[PDB]
């Protein structure tokens, strides 16, 4: 159900192993346990196995079988061939979101006649303002994203100092996103809206009308990459002008958001092709829209 299949550590060993079990001598992997060099430390009633027909033969079958039918065993290749780092691991990787603004409300129709109520969010400037890893520990990494370029004198003097240190243009607002080390983008990166795919789900954190709220499921409807808008099939209870922290909803009940069936994200971030210039581009042809719900 909502539990995985239970497995105890006392049960993982040679006889329970799905593929051949491997013993580690540290320079070399063999299918025999390591025979201690000092023979007088051998225990009574313990066999030291240099060769075993039973286990060696089964292994022999397995390997030759893997090579002669590579089309059947292409899954088995996962055992022997691990994916390198970066490269968007489907299970491992988490990217950062971006900071939006609830702008207005709208109404849309799908393919059929239906009245949708859309809330439009605006992502005026999203940069990566800060990198923070806490004492170098694992899984502690944060990318801080800022929004809304802002005049020199806006903030209390102590915030302005922060932006001066960073090197980023001064922002009205920041939010941190916990991420995996592969999802890092260099400080000062301009973030686009197509960082989100039009068919995905998105976790939204904003201020209610008066504490902080989180909507974890909400799908994306439509995206303007000219006016840097984004649309949601929802009515928030929130003030117009409210900043909203966007994220990817990472899983829905045993299902990853990102997979070959569904699709793949623009992994560390969306980056634009150098040839395009939004300055030559109109509002309408700039639209990206979802498949039918």
């Amino acid at each position: 159900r909502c539990y995985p299949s239970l497995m105890r550590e006392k049960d993982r060993d040679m006889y329970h192993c799905y593929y051949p079990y491997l013993f580690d001598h540290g320079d070399k992997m063999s299918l025999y346990p390591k025979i201690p060099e000092n023979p007088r430390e051998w225990q009574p009633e313990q066999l030291q196995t240099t060769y075993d027909a039973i286990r060696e033969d089964k292994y022999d079958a397995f390997i030759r079988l893997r090579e002669k039918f590579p089309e059947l065993y292409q899954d088995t290749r996962a055992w022997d061939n691990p994916p390198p780092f970066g490269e968007f691991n489907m299970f491992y990787s988490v990217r950062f979101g971006m900071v939006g603004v609830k702008a207005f409300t709208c109404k849309d129709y799908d393919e059929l006649g239906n009245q949708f109520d859309c809330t439009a969010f605006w992502f005026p400037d999203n940069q990566v303002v800060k990198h923070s890893t806490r004492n170098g520990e694992v899984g502690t990494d944060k990318v801080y994203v800022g929004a809304m370029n802002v005049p020199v004198e806006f903030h209390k003097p102590h915030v302005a100092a922060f932006y001066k240190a960073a090197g980023v243009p001064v922002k009205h607002v920041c939010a941190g996103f916990p991420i995996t080390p592969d999802a890092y983008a260099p400080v000062g990166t301009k973030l686009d809206v197509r960082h989100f795919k039009p068919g995905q789900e998105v976790t939204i954190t904003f201020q209610n009308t008066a504490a902080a709220e989180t909507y974890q499921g909400v799908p994306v409807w439509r995206i303007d990459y000219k006016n840097s808008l984004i649309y949601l099939p929802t009515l928030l209870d929130a003030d117009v002008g409210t900043y909203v922290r966007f994220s990817d909803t990472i899983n829905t009940k045993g299902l990853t958001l990102w997979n070959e069936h569904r699709g793949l994200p623009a992994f560390p971030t969306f980056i634009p092709p150098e040839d395009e210039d939004l300055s030559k581009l109109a509002t309408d042809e700039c639209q990206l829209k979802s498949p039918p719900l």
Binding site: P157, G167, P272, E274
Partner: protein, 206 residues
């Protein structure tokens, strides 16, 4: 190629010069400082007020890796001016927060400025240029001494306004998130440990 608009004139002084944008503009707009250490030190002494101190520091902590040894020396010398061997090292306190029963003290933007400088130095002299500290003992002793002048290993006296009521602001966290910002900062950690491990070769071979 050509201007999309006219450019109204300025005389030599009021130009914005002294900085440069990162190699790739349309993607990364980060601003790097080109200023020489001479005039950053200059700005630091000659405009004594907090924000220009912070600005000077924030610049010379961007630029650390790109400068030679004696440049670093006159930097640290310039910076260490306002510190008493007697006094609490890094404390610059502005607001008293009387909100809860006993008074709470908030430092100003100078504190994260100095710490940011120490951390910049940590990335420079340990991570990407590990040789440089062994090369010249002059700047070794300089860094060590500036590091002893601000007292980095008792951050607790950065947050203390009265020696009778010593603050634990640096040493104490709660799970409800009190002191999340002022919580444990590795500050001199890599730097001190590393420059200990420079002296830690006890082997008779070398």
């Amino acid at each position: 190629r050509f201007p999309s608009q006219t450019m109204s004139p300025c005389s030599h002084e009021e130009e914005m010069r002294g900085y440069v944008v990162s190699r790739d503009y349309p993607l990364i707009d980060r601003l790097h400082c080109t200023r020489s250490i001479e005039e950053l030190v200059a700005q630091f002494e000659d405009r004594p007020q907090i924000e220009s101190r912070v600005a000077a520091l924030a610049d010379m902590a961007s630029t650390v890796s790109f400068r030679s040894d004696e440049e670093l020396l006159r930097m640290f010398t310039a910076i260490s001016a306002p510190f008493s061997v007697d006094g609490r090292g890094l404390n610059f306190l502005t607001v008293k927060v009387s909100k809860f029963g006993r008074p709470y003290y908030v430092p100003n933007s100078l504190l994260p400025a100095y710490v940011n400088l120490v951390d910049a130095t940590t990335i420079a002299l340990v991570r990407e240029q590990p040789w440089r500290l062994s090369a010249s003992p002059a700047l070794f002793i300089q860094v060590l001494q500036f590091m002893a002048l601000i007292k980095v290993f008792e951050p607790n006296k950065w947050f203390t306004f009265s020696d009778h009521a010593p603050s634990n602001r640096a040493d104490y966290r709660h799970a409800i998130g009190v002191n999340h910002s002022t919580a444990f900062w590795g500050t001199g950690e890599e730097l001190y440990d590393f420059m200990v491990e420079l002296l830690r070769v006890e082997d008779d071979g070398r």
